Amino acid sequence: AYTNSFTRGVYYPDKVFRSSVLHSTQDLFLPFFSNVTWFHNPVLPFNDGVYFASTEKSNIIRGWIFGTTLDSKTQSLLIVNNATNVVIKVCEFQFCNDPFNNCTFEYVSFKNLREFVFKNYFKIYSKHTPINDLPQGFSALEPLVDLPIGINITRFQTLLAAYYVGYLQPRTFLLKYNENGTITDAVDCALDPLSETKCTLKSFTVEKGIYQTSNFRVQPTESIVRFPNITNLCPFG
Amino acid sequence: TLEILDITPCSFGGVSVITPGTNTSNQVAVLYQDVNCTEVNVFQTRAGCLIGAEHVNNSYECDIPIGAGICASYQT
Amino acid sequence: QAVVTQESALTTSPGETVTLTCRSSTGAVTTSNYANWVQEKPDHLFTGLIGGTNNRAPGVPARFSGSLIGDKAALTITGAQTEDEAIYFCALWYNNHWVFGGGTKLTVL
Amino acid sequence: QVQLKQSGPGLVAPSQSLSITCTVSGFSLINYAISWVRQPPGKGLEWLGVIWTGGGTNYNSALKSRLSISKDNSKSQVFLKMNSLQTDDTARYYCARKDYYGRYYGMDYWGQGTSVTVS
Amino acid sequence: GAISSVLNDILSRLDPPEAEVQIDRLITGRLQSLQTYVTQQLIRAAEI
Amino acid sequence: GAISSVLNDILSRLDPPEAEVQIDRLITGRLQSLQTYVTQQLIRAAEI
Amino acid sequence: EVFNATRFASVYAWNRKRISNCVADYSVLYNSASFSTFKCYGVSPTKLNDLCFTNVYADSFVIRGDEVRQIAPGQTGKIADYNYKLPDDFTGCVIAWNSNNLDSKVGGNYNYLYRLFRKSNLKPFERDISTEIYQAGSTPCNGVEGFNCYFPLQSYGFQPTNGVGYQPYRVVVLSFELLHAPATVCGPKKSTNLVKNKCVNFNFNGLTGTGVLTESNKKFLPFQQFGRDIADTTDAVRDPQ
Amino acid sequence: NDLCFTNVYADSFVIRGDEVRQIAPGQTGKIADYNYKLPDDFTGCVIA
Ligand SMILES: *[C@@H]1O[C@H](CO)[C@@H](O[C@@H]2O[C@H](CO)[C@@H](O[C@@H]3O[C@H](CO)[C@@H](O)[C@H](O)[C@@H]3O)[C@H](O)[C@H]2NC(C)=O)[C@H](O)[C@H]1NC(C)=O
Ligand SMILES: *[C@@H]1O[C@H](CO)[C@@H](O[C@@H]2O[C@H](CO)[C@@H](O[C@@H]3O[C@H](CO)[C@@H](O)[C@H](O)[C@@H]3O)[C@H](O)[C@H]2NC(C)=O)[C@H](O)[C@H]1NC(C)=O
Ligand SMILES: *[C@@H]1O[C@H](CO)[C@@H](O[C@@H]2O[C@H](CO)[C@@H](O)[C@H](O)[C@H]2NC(C)=O)[C@H](O)[C@H]1NC(C)=O
Ligand SMILES: *[C@@H]1O[C@H](CO)[C@@H](O[C@@H]2O[C@H](CO)[C@@H](O)[C@H](O)[C@H]2NC(C)=O)[C@H](O)[C@H]1NC(C)=O
Ligand SMILES: *[C@@H]1O[C@H](CO)[C@@H](O[C@@H]2O[C@H](CO)[C@@H](O)[C@H](O)[C@H]2NC(C)=O)[C@H](O)[C@H]1NC(C)=O
Ligand SMILES: *[C@@H]1O[C@H](CO)[C@@H](O[C@@H]2O[C@H](CO)[C@@H](O)[C@H](O)[C@H]2NC(C)=O)[C@H](O)[C@H]1NC(C)=O
Ligand SMILES: *[C@@H]1O[C@H](CO[C@@H]2O[C@@H](C)[C@@H](O)[C@@H](O)[C@@H]2O)[C@@H](O)[C@H](O)[C@H]1NC(C)=O
Ligand SMILES: *[C@@H]1O[C@H](CO)[C@@H](O)[C@H](O)[C@H]1NC(C)=O
User: Fold this and answer.
1) CA A12 to ligand 3 centroid distance, Å
2) Is E28 exposed, middle or buried (0-12, 13-18, 19+ CB in 10 A)?
3) How far apart are CA F23 and CA F9, in angstroms?
4) What are the beta bridge partners of residue G174?
């Protein structure tokens, strides 16, 4: 099926504080109100980043597999949860086509709504929230781990009842930082003209009036080359 | 062919956002300055094409000025 | 379309130049099918004389001079009194494989 | 100095198998290719086959597919294998160096020769 | 100061790693001319 | 135009003979911005 | 370990190792056994001991003696094209030194491999590991290595009696970042005790400045590292120790 | 086709196939030596 992410998928883009300030940033974000593919476990692509969400009770959601070919030929990343611990490893795995060598790395460390952002070296952000099909809420995502491995990624599959997958686009966002320095709101600077106005004013309330926001410029369509009448051909003949 | 061609520069212009204060509503109208409307509730004015606003007959005092004797306002 | 031949007969007095022609089955040979000239000493010693249908090999004297003189591949050696007593083979690159010539016996004076 | 070496017992009876090896110095198998030629007693030389510089073999079309040639990039050795001999196969066999990269596209050097006789 | 005034001619003729110098020269010149125009308009506006 | 807007980072990374170019880039930019501000203040003060 | 490493990779498979989370000591390496070219961009070599870096990539390969010239950001040549592309605004240091004593062997070392053929120039830090047979001729090859069909990998032939410009130079490129993430590699500079409530010059992880440091009542979140003001001026810091 | 040259010079010779082979840049023959010769480095195109 399909769903729309109302106001979800904002992560602290960097490791710098702020307080009671409106900060404009440009990075890979999930566009507001966009299409999220709602599933129930095929191999999805990994376009430029992934917003992933799940709501599970008995922890059916367990992990993820990332890679290019998802087989022994090429490298691949496995993140798995066991009651023992969480295992993150990148190797030249041999992946069964129905998930249930040369290893270079290892790391060990409805009401439940779990949000994740996987972007590319590999950065993983997350949040766990109590919930009551995505909600209308707004929760910033705090950074969780950075893997300095730099593998080549094009596809991923989830290692498992209901999860939502969206993809990230290079958008500009206006973030509102409150006193404790937690992102409390955000405006997508390209969703609609009112949002463009808010971003231009660097404010969240726009007083009545007429404001100039951007520039319309019709683009060219084709190339035209013309030259004089072709004659007087050289008498090689 | 011995023909003469005019060169006009491709249309450009400002885009202006006509908003009642977000306290009143989230609705918006958009003015594309100095462009015929075909290029872009479309209305033609000496300022350009106005999209999203309804061109009533009768006149009221000016609320949000546009240009060449047109104003926009938020009314029922 | 595979015949390779040489005159198998050569004898040049010193001071006069001679041309020996190797003829394939495709008529006039083009450089596209690369031509090679190799020399056989009576002690089963081999060396490269001409390559690329026009190019002399490295280390063989410039007195050896081979070109596409005729329609078919050819070789020209200026007369020498002693060191020219040897066998010569022509080689042509068919699309798939190499064909080697019959061999020509030179007996100066 | 650039040089080609090839070694083997040579003396074979009919219908059994013997293999010949060519060992090289002064150049790499990566910058060159190796071709093999064969010299029966009193008859003209014939082309056996070629190993490409970076993998991939070729063999004479009329020559049987029941044979293989092999090489060593690191230690610079090449091996030719014949798995069954017949009395027409007696000849002297030569390894040779081919430089298709170089301006002298044709074979540059040749082996020192091994006698192979039947009975 | 740039070798030519046409931005496309600078871009298509000179090497991209060095063209930034010529582009910067044009950018400073044109920005200065624009600021001069704006200041003149500001003063004339006060007079009007 | 300089590598980094932090003049302490330029002076902590580069060596004095070369750094002068980057510092000069910053100095021209900042001096032009300050002059623009001062001119705007003069005009606005006349209005007031 | 990298500098004293005996076995070096091929140039087209130039080996990249990340270095991070260690105190480095660049001055002792700069004091050199006559390295052919310790040449640095974007940083002064004497100061290297002072800056803190996020990560320091180190790339290693062995090339010809005189071709080292090609290891530059704005450079052209076969190596810069089909082997290694230094991006413009490169912020690091290039190290090269002759390795004729070790690498080159009598008669010519032939296991060293440099490529000569590719469709286009390599991207910045591109690894064309694949060895597909080049369609050098206009006609497709599809596995043919004929006279006009060529292989993209070529050996070098390092012999001791070659030209001095052709002797084996080992080359290591150090690429720095100079970003503001937790700078986990830094020079051997000592720590120092802290003093508050006084105008003092300070260096926190290479973040330098002058100011009076006071105990602050901000609520940093655990992943935060420092604070910034309304107009991008560092307002608060987390003490490393 | 794209490029333009100052002037076009055409030489017409009747020569045998061997002489035609001899009529090549740098080729050596009696025809090349005496009948027709040209500078080796000079750009030339021959239609036979
Ligand atoms: C991944 O692990 C596998 C095994 O777990 C290893 O691959 C083996 O070792 C090398 C790669 O390091 C390769 O063998 C090579 O073969 C070529 C000729 O075919 C030649 O250069 C050498 O003889 C070398 O042994 C190959 O990948 C494989 N060896 C086999 C199949 O015999 C290796 O540890 C890791 N790398 C790769 C690429 O597999
Ligand atoms: C990272 O992995 C990707 C995925 O394999 C590779 O980049 C590009 O991948 C495409 C296919 O995903 C390949 O090019 C195309 O292959 C398809 C196969 O059907 C076909 O339409 C064409 O033959 C086309 O060439 C190719 O593997 C690759 N293309 C490139 C690099 O131009 C590649 O392995 C990695 N990409 C990186 C590191 O940028
Ligand atoms: C910032 O965080 C604090 C605590 O996490 C919260 O604000 C507190 O609100 C209660 C209600 O009076 C009191 O404890 C204090 O007035 C506040 N500060 C602290 C430290 O407790 C709230 O989450 C945030 N403060 C806001 C939104 O004003
Ligand atoms: C905007 O639209 C039309 C065409 O899209 C414009 O083009 C012509 O303009 C001339 C002079 O203004 C008119 O006489 C023609 O009738 C127009 N062509 C049409 C209407 O097809 C025109 O400039 C604009 N029309 C307005 C402002 O009414
Ligand atoms: C008020 O609105 C319309 C335009 O919005 C006015 O313009 C046209 O007037 C003629 C009068 O003969 C009508 O026939 C047209 O239908 C009107 N245009 C449109 C688009 O409707 C018009 O004066 C007014 N409309 C009324 C009074 O019905
Ligand atoms: C060397 O530096 C480390 C930095 O981690 C010190 O280890 C601890 O660091 C944590 C940081 O939150 C603090 O609790 C203390 O600064 C340190 N605690 C302990 C128990 O060591 C370490 O102490 C430093 N070395 C010395 C001798 O002080
Ligand atoms: C903004 O409006 C807030 C209350 O809204 C009131 O009711 C709506 C339906 C409109 O009629 C609006 O004009 C009214 O004001 C109040 O906070 C306040 O009146 C307005 N101004 C500010 C600064 O909040
Ligand atoms: C989700 O995708 C569908 C396409 O089937 C599209 O019609 C719909 O508008 C999208 N959702 C939103 C909120 O735009």
Assistant:
1) 21
2) middle
3) 11
4) G58, G93
**Annotated domain spans of chain D:** 3-118
G2 near G172, Cβ under 8 Å? yes
Cβ distance A18 to G218 less than 8 Å, yes or no, reads: no
Cα separation, C77 vs C106, in Å, equals 11
Question: Residue E46 is nearest to which of F1, F36, F46, comparing CB atoms?
Answer: F46
Per the CB < 8 A criterion, the answer to whether D22 and D77 are in contact is yes
Whether H18 contacts chain C with CB within 8 A: yes
A153 Cα–ligand 2 center, Å: 11
Counting CB pairs under 8 A, whether chains A and D reach 3 or more, is no
CATH of the domain at A64: 2.60.120.960
Chains G, H in contact, 3 or more Cβ pairs below 8 Å: no
- Is A230 domain-assigned? no
Pick the residue from chain A with its C-alpha nearest to B24: A208
State whether CATH 3.20.20.150 applies to domain D3-118: no
CA G161 – CA G140 distance, rounded (Å): 40
| Spatial distance between the Cα atoms of B19 and H41, rounded to a whole number of angstroms | 75
Q: Best residue in F13, F15, F22, F33 to probe G by mutation, most G CBs within 10 Å?
A: F13
Give the residue extent of every domain in chain C. 5-106
F3 contacts G42? CB cut-off 8 A: yes
Chain F stretch 3-42, residues whose beta carbon is closer than 8 A to a beta carbon of chain G:
3, 8-9, 12-15, 18
Solved with: cryo-EM
Q: Which amino acid is at E5?
A: S
Q: How far is CA A74 from CA A70, A94, D54, D111, H28, in A?
A: 7, 10, 23, 42, 57
Total number of domains in chain A:
1
User: G141: buried, middle or exposed (CB in 10 Å: 19+, 13-18, 0-12)?
Assistant: middle
State this model's resolution in angstroms: 3.2
Selecting from E35, E39, E46 the residue whose C-beta is nearest the C-beta of F47 gives: E46
Q: In the CATH hierarchy, which top-level class contains the domain C5-106?
A: mainly beta
Burial (CB count within 10 angstroms: exposed 0-12, middle 13-18, buried 19+), residue G177: middle
